């Protein structure tokens with residue numbers, strides 16, 4: 001009955017969802033897409049995510065309902081299981097606020113830092129600085145919030161799960177966390193979770 | 205009024221003023237002047253630690269603050285029962301297309317604006333990257349809009365999030381030509397009285 005099909009790859013956005021699945025204890029199976037062979041752009045996959053990116057899930061127990069966008073998947077799974085997002089109005093909204101901060105801010109900006117720092121054909125220092133500086137500013141917003149609360153929305157939630165896999169690779173992006181003591185505490189706490197350790201290994 | 209709206213005349217601010225106008229919620233406008241750096245003032249950072257607009261304070265809910273346009277939209281829809289279905293699949297479709305906007309259209313078209321209009325040096329590579337990526341996202345929107353009248357089926361907060369960005373495509377240097385479904389959707393939304401009102405907030 002219960003089964004999530006997960007279409008993913010070893011990237012921060014993929015790890016968001018595998019971490020969530022491991023935390024929640026939901027049965028799932030992994031379809032690891034090869035970017036090398038453009039499998040994320042194949043017609044059969046566009047039927048599931050028209051954007052042709054990972055992650056996406058198909059919920060086999062819900063008439064093979066497709067969900068794309070890591071943040072939407074996290075919300076779907078949290079509502080499905082009642083875990084990792086409070087049911088009350090304020091608690092729920094706080095989670096969604098920090099989740100949106102990740103989806104609109106941390107992920108896209110740090111991703112562009114990766115692009116210009118590591119992947120772009122030509123070296124453009126102006127673009128590199130823009131994104132590394134913007135990522136660092138966002139990290140400072142997180143650090144400030146984590147001075148008032150143990151996790152972003154209070155208790156650990158899908159907002160922390162969305163954000164951690166990006167912060168985790170800050171060195172790859174060329175962004176330092178020096179001086180960010182609250183963020184560092186949070187990094188240490190999350191990386192110690194067994195579900196997080198298991199989720200980071202998917203796909204293998 | 206029940207809602208205090210902190211905003212400025214940008215696509216992200218227009219998402220929320222459009223939403224409030226569609227829903228018939230009374231609100232008070234606080235137009236922040238970036239010229240005087242009002243969005244970096246400590247009193248505003250208490251509401252949105254990221255120091256950006258839009259943000260709201262819901263007077264009807266113990267002065268609860270909500271930041272991030274996408275989170276504000278979900279909050280308002282849940283408060284009013286408007287512009288997002290109650291059922292599992294219907295709700296999720298809205299959230300998926302909302303996340304597509306928040307993580308994709310907004311950030312990518314915003315970077316196109318930066319390199320095309322605002323960056324201290326002309327970097328044709330960067331301009332091309334974000335204009336091409338924006339066009340690619342528009343084509344995905346166009347495809348979906350062949351399957352349904354609006355992004356999630358019925359008109360919803362997912363359309364309200366996406367329209368203020370598509371509306372300014374020319375500023376970003378990106379064409380909608382050849383995208384007949386997207387063009388149908390642009391025309392249908394621009395014809396809505398509440399959209400016309402929301403786009404005028406705040407006044408000069």
Ligand SMILES: N[C@@H](CCC(=O)N[C@@H](CS)C(=O)NCC(=O)O)C(=O)O
Nearest residue numbers: 011012013053054055069070071307
């Ligand atoms: N906002 C989306 C972004 C997903 C995304 O950027 N996925 C990347 C890998 S981390 C991808 O599939 N890239 C392959 C491609 O664009 O061809 C989400 O969070 O799910």
Ligand SMILES: N[C@@H](CCC(=O)N[C@@H](CS)C(=O)NCC(=O)O)C(=O)O
Nearest residue numbers: 104214215216256257258272273274
């Ligand atoms: N993802 C955020 C983006 C907010 C955002 O970037 N707002 C801009 C105006 S559209 C802003 O406040 N910029 C002023 C600044 O960056 O200082 C949201 O949708 O609320």
